[PDB]
Amino acid sequence: HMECADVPLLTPSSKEMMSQALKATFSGFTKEQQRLGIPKDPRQWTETHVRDWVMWAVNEFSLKGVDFQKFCMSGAALCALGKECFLELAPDFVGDILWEHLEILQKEDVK
């Protein structure tokens, strides 16, 4: 999930760059969560928070090909779907990023 055993020193790899973006995006999330009202816990989310986030995640990582029609549901539903289901809703590339940070919200905010 995100990064598995990585020590940034002298090992330039795409995996390190992937975490870099995610790490910097986090700070840009709370700034939006306060502007829109989106809570930290993904289970207490709704269609608006889901879409507003997805869209925001597309601007943070300049993603493309992701649709909000597939994510037209509340957080409780999105979480219930699981990684596989969520990955089926979003593209083969962007889907990973969203679920990466999305899953973090779950672990960070248990229940």
Curated annotation (Swiss-Prot):
Belongs to the ETS family. The modification Phosphothreonine is found at residue 11. The gene is Ets1. Ubiquitinated; which induces proteasomal degradation. Transcription factor. Directly controls the expression of cytokine and chemokine genes in a wide variety of different cellular contexts. May control the differentiation, survival and proliferation of lymphoid cells. May also regulate angiogenesis through regulation of expression of genes controlling endothelial cell migration and invasion. There is a cross-link at residue 111 (Glycyl lysine isopeptide (Lys-Gly) (interchain with G-Cter in SUMO2)). It is found in: Nucleus; Cytoplasm. Residues 24-109 form the PNT domain. The chain holds residues 29 to 138 of 440 of the full protein. This is Protein C-ets-1. Binds DNA as a homodimer; homodimerization is required for transcription activation. Interacts with MAF and MAFB. Interacts with PAX5; the interaction alters DNA-binding properties. Interacts with DAXX. Interacts with UBE2I. Interacts with SP100; the interaction is direct and modulates ETS1 transcriptional activity. The lineage of its organism: Eukaryota, Metazoa, Chordata, Craniata, Vertebrata. It comes from Mus musculus.
